[PDB]
Design a protein around this ligand. Structure first.
Ligand SMILES: Cc1cn([C@H]2C[C@H](O)[C@@H](COP(=O)(O)OP(=O)(O)OP(=O)(O)O)O2)c(=O)[nH]c1=O
Ligand SMILES: Cc1cn([C@H]2C[C@H](O)[C@@H](COP(=O)(O)OP(=O)(O)OP(=O)(O)O)O2)c(=O)[nH]c1=O
Ligand SMILES: Cc1cn([C@H]2C[C@H](O)[C@@H](COP(=O)(O)OP(=O)(O)OP(=O)(O)O)O2)c(=O)[nH]c1=O
Ligand SMILES: Cc1cn([C@H]2C[C@H](O)[C@@H](COP(=O)(O)OP(=O)(O)OP(=O)(O)O)O2)c(=O)[nH]c1=O
Ligand SMILES: Cc1cn([C@H]2C[C@H](O)[C@@H](COP(=O)(O)OP(=O)(O)OP(=O)(O)O)O2)c(=O)[nH]c1=O
Ligand SMILES: [Mg+2]
Ligand SMILES: [Mg+2]
Ligand SMILES: [Mg+2]
Ligand SMILES: [Mg+2]
Ligand SMILES: [Mg+2]
Lengths: 271, 258, 275, 274, 271, 261
DNA sequence: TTTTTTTTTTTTTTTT
């Protein structure tokens, strides 16, 4: 029997309480959800063309340089060279992959190796090269590397309803046991009336494909909106949908994109 | 049954002129008349409506004012977290969010032993054998089971087993499950009224229970701290519908009516 | 184990950012925003019915098989191999060969047929295809591996999701699309996809100049999530002034109205307009 | 099976001098921007409920059967076999046969019925079907077995009776039966209910997405012809022909006008200008 | 069984060797030419405008005056009510609206004077209350050998769009190649703006509620209109909406309702 | 299942062996003349405009005054509440609205002076609030059955319910009076309700043999003035105004009036 | 053989 009375728990609470990881850009988030904590499963939601991976790659950068924590990326959507070059271009403030005038410049100038060890000289970042296999690799990332942040790029091609229920229960048990700060990306569904999500429609908590337990086992959900064919396609609206630790949800802040650099930077906007 | 008018003279005379009670929005036990022995109680709402917080408040008010043994089954979190939340709820402090106070109080043992000087509560980290042990060797009068979605026919057999166990013992039992995904319109998190159809797994959950309580609030709205409570079923009374209103009282954490 | 650390990955990046392009034709704004087609992308071209979603594709296939020397493969499933190989001859020779009976017999008589056939198909560049979703991908691999095609065009994806009998069609489109994207990322071939648009709810039709949204892709929601460029064509039947909409650019961020084209009922080329 | 385009020197040649259109009747504005009807060319005809589809297609079947020598097979599902046969006889002899018991009793006693019958069905040009995968099997029995040049189907809404997947599979099968076989295939479908305003039978101009059953009917059809008239208005015999889709040429819009004959049943090209 | 045109040399000659005339108004018979074997006739109006009474009158006229066997399937009311209505409306009275007159006809033995004169030559068949309907109608048309089959209030028989569509397809297939006039009664949906169908709204063809299969499979469509709130609640208007044999639609004529004998007579009111 | 006309030799005479009247306003029996077996009477007004005030009054005048075995199936409340509603309505007092009178009537022995005069001869029946309404007719024998508040009792369900209740009325010899409501707009100011102001679907008016609408202008000059309008009558055809009735606030009753309108 | 969850396409039924 593993039943424990309330009296014989005095030390286990006293040792227990002896904020967490903050966000970068849209500074109303950590003002609202008080940042991520060890043992949380986070969902990032938008449509295609909104820049979910662009948002999460900045968080991968800022939690590996300023915080020094062991950050493990899981780019199931793309290759490791593309995300490595995007990290180099984001840290070095100048857009790398989306320009050809500089790709041949910085390789013959000799400062490629200068930019490489400036950000990968530590043992911080760990990439993944493309269910049971993925979870065994995450267990190796947790044991054999000591990762503190794990980012998972795309969950829909992980499924070739119950296969998402089993996956989300297994991921929640993994984050409960190991206590790793986890970010998991999923997409939105197709609405049947009115505008789509990509033209400035506010996203409700229903809009989760595949199954319905994506909102039942995750600890917080961040959504991003932006009128794509609009008067400005740069201003994003960030919306907290759920928070089990604080509870306060809604519209948090507003960011612009800064097309030369690529940094999601906060913008003042009354309404 | 078909009601005739032959043997119904002395019953109607009773119509002109309970057990454990519920705390907060007091038209619960004014309407369904509290908790009774041998019942199976369901509190089902949307994801994030405060099911666990409401049953945590009721587990507080059924263990101190009544003194009865309270056996929890919090298979969603750990035993220290729900204990810190109960200590902060008794001490009127949002504990697990106030980071400076957590190291300021460590009077910590003073607030611990004040509410745990008895052997009242019994937490938990097969499961029916554990519940039978909590019922026989410990004298529990309230048993709460928070998560049952991972614990059709695989849920129906478990519900038959729980209903037979409750009828055989005679203990107050509260079991929590979630709601299904609505198809058209808004969701339950934006003010949609919950019907008895919306229960995941199967349909025996409404046929083998005794009362169902639902909560609805506008989570993406102006007031995310104003629920509406709805009784959906009560085999003893029958009075269903709107019960009351609770605001969360952010500073403290007590669901208080207004 | 494939958990490659970020420090021991320099050389690969050394052979990555030195060794892109392959510009479109007919319009300039398509090459400004999307910056051409790349090895390993999926470019999707959408329209209504009879709106010219194959004419722009063949006008792009002629420029990418002759003016740049790339080997091009055509999985055309609407049209047989006898018509789409006959439209290209008159297009390069700037006429409408299929829509005219006189010019057909004129190039029969004087012997100009062999001259026009050898000027176009004198180089081993265009590899066609004629017409169950399992053998099509094997034929695409047979085109890419041995023959070595750079731009492969999958015309009319709706036939392999409709003639294939499935109870649930959404998972069929999702699984076909993710296996196709996996093939395109594995072999690194430029891939063009043609799909249709569904029935709208009310109002105008897409064949009457309705401004198309990204959510109107017919069949599933897996079409817009695993494509890298979405380009839409919109006219009003001036039944020849078509506008082009970049609905989703993964690589860059410039989306919106790209440009304007004009179709020629004398030659068959999509010239750019000026408005 | 993949092929290389340098082995195609003998087949593109053979296709180049093989392909000959069948000219429409009733309006010459149809033949100018469609150039007729070819092998492997699914032609859709639609109108409102009872607005003149079967009369038009039966006249087209008469003109393609007795004036151009083309063997024609029909699959009429609305009516009986003897009814459409007597309708063809009465329309070829320029009378109104079935709508008059007096002429039907008149021609059966003086023996001119056999004279009207042998001049049509002497050469054995028409073939009929006696009332869905067995349907295409019998159509291939008609085509590959006998050898008619134009196959007409009517009233496809019986054949599909989740309707959308069924009619999508049916439209793909009919397109595959038309293409790469060598037959013209004529298909008739209906319209759905409108949202607001006036009805399709009261003179509303029909759009392309009004084809009831799916939107998979307008993506696999080559030529789409829509007939529309006002049966309650001042001119209830002035049909308007609207070409909605044309894969071969691309010109869409109003072809012209046709005027139906209240006595002989021959809708003929009128000269009304709006 | 692909049959060529040569094999109909003897069949067409047998097919050349008949419209059943409508009663109540001769304006219907001029632009319909009656009804042949395999001729689906849809009869509609608003709610309570006399769809059952007009079809009951035609069931009377086609049975006792022309010798054609009529098989009714009245589902609005039961068997005894429509039998009393047929007897009272052949004897030109209002039978059910007079308690003393129902009681008198058994005291003087004249009940068999009105039963024998009508129901003796087997010229009628009834039906008491979807594939259990057609299986009995086929027995009504095969073994019994009736000539006009009548179906009342089709909404009892019926997502109710595929159901009414397959029903109308089965009824059309049962009518064709059998040789029977299949009278079918349907209804009309709600109006949207202005006045209602019970106040005399000019009905359109697309108001046949349930599907579009009620206006695309019927050979003849007859609609009735009556302003029961205006000046004359005894003057109905008859509108032919579809005729696949002749091709004339519009106002067929006016019929005057008589509030004494239960009959409606041909009226001569002009607009 | 096929019924010829030869086997109706005596069975039409079997139908010759009668309607059931109405009360309160005499304009109802003038143009409807009652209700036999197989008749459905839809009675409606706005949601809370006094449907049950007239329905239970007719059920009272049919049960204790004309001997007909009235059975209600009130599904808003249980057995005891509507039984005490029948008692307090028959004894002309506002029962469930004042604690003083309910306090005063329980002790002075005027309770069991009221049970044997109404509920003693087992006519009134109720439901334990398909397989039950057949036993309510066969074993019990009650005929005039009322079902209320169909919004708890949105197109397929109401059509299937109305079709099964239509089939329950037919071939039984039973009078099933069903109550429904109106769609939202103002209906509380005397707005003329046509037959199109139903809600749910249009399948209600297709099977309802008789349709009765109730109007009242509770916001004008005299709020206690109501009106009854027949909308659909399949037995006669005469539909329209029954007359005027006046309501009373202190006793809870209504009287037929003849105001000049 | 009997249930539950979930995604995308077309046709008719109703409302502030
Ligand atoms: C946030 C943002 C991104 N962008 C551009 C920059 C990048 O080129 C691109 C980033 O979007 P992606 O991150 O590539 O798209 P996604 O991950 O959200 O969607 P999916 O996985 O389904 O394909 O969008 C803008 O133009 N404006 C913006 O505000
Ligand atoms: C009711 C309410 C709760 N909250 C907080 C309290 C909790 O921390 C959180 C929601 O209550 P929880 O009880 O934690 O939600 P849950 O247990 O039902 O979630 P799950 O379905 O995954 O089991 O939000 C508010 O902030 N405002 C409110 O009005
Ligand atoms: C775009 C365009 C096409 N056309 C003509 C030329 C094209 O050959 C003809 C249609 O040919 P397609 O380009 O093949 O038509 P489509 O691809 O849009 O339709 P489907 O999906 O059925 O294949 O339209 C014009 O006349 N003007 C125009 O602007
Ligand atoms: C077009 C037209 C038809 N008519 C009449 C006479 C024709 O025989 C009749 C058309 O009969 P059909 O052509 O057989 O009917 P349809 O194809 O339009 O529709 P459906 O089969 O679905 O019912 O309409 C005219 O009188 N004038 C006209 O201009
Ligand atoms: C025909 C007609 C009937 N009436 C009266 C007497 C009829 O019995 C009554 C109509 O009853 P029904 O004929 O039964 O009404 P209905 O069949 O058109 O519609 P539903 O079955 O949906 O109710 O109205 C008139 O007042 N004027 C008339 O012109
Ligand atoms: Mg992405
Ligand atoms: Mg919980
Ligand atoms: Mg095309
Ligand atoms: Mg026809
Ligand atoms: Mg009727």
């Amino acid at each position: 029997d593993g039943v424990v009375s309330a009296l014989s728990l005095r030390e286990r609470i006293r040792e227990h309480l002896s904020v967490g990881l903050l966000f970068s850009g849209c500074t109303g988030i950590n003002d609202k959800t008080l940042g991520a904590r060890g043992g949380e499963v986070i969902m990032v939601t938008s449509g295609s063309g909104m820049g979910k991976s662009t948002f999460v790659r900045q968080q991968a950068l800022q939690w590996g340089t300023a915080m020094g924590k062991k950050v493990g990326l899981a780019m199931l959507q793309e290759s490791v060279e593309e995300t490595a070059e995007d990290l180099i271009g984001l840290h070095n403030r100048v857009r790398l992959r989306q320009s050809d005038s500089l790709k041949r410049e910085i390789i013959e100038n000799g400062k490629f190796d200068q930019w490489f060890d400036e950000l990968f000289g530590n043992d911080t970042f760990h990439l993944y090269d493309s269910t049971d296999r993925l979870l065994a690799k995450l267990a190796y990332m947790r044991s054999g590397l000591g990762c503190d942040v794990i980012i998972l790029d795309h969950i829909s091609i992980v499924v070739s309803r119950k296969m998402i229920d089993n996956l989300m229960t297994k991921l929640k048990g993994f984050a409960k046991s190991t206590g790793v700060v986890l970010v998991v990306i999923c997409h939105l569904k197709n609405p049947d009336k009115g505008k789509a999500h990509e033209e400035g429609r506010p996203v409700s908590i229903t809009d989760l494909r595949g199954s319905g337990a994506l909102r039942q086992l995750s600890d917080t959900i961040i959504a991003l909106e932006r009128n794509q064919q609009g008067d400005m396609p740069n201003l994003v609206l960030v919306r907290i949908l759920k928070c089990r630790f604080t509870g306060d949800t809604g519209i948090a802040g507003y960011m612009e994109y800064n097309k030369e650099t690529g940094w999601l930077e906060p913008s003042s906007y009354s309404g």
